[PDB]
Amino acid sequence: GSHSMRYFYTAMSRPGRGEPRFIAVGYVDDTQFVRFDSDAASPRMAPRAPWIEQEGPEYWDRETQISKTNTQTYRESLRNLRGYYNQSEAGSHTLQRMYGCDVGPDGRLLRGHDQSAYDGKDYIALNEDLSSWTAADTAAQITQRKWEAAREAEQWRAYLEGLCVEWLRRYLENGKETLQRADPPKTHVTHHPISDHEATLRCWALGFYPAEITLTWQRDGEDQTQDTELVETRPAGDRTFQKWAAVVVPSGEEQRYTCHVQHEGLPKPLTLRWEP
């Protein structure tokens, strides 16, 4: 029963098509709960889960103002980064940031996070000590020096240990009937012949939350890691997730294979076979 709060910032320049777009979304575990888009007709931080709606106007005003400010600061940061890499004003670039806090079952801070990426590649990250930085290159070393001068690590540590955890605990209580509820997978095994020689056994997991899940095929109790096709866990659109794992088996040998399912919502891990 550990939990996390994470914010995801994306800023993207588009020369000739206006000023860089700024997007911010917030999550608790795998549940999105706020969003902001600087391209909206009237940009505001807006609710995306029922349990956040109860927050009062001073909350929504604070989060809107921070995000409107960030829209401008991320435009400055994108100009700076273009300079740091001697890039032309003609090209499009992306700046991403993700930060947040993890807590354990007792609500104590397990560790905090703040990382930044430029055009998809790691740029600067706050170290686990919440007091030092790891810069990817000599461009990020400029950012690090700026941030050391402004004592940013100090402020991050205070946020990550203080309000980040306190508001996450508050969200966890306000949304407890969903945020603190693990829904187990609905499972089954399907059989798809390929030829007279082989067939596919596919193990399905549906409707589960949170997304963390382990789905493995075994042949005589040995794992088929290199032989299993795992699809990426995907959202159903109703808060829950889906996944499948498949293995090609020699026809007639289907009963040597077991599918194994681990999920927090499950009282016990499951073992499944094809049932013709």
Partner: peptide, 9 residues
């Protein structure tokens, strides 16, 4: 609850 707006990169 967002982190306060901070310094540009």
């Amino acid at each position: 609850h967002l982190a306060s707006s901070g310094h540009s990169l």
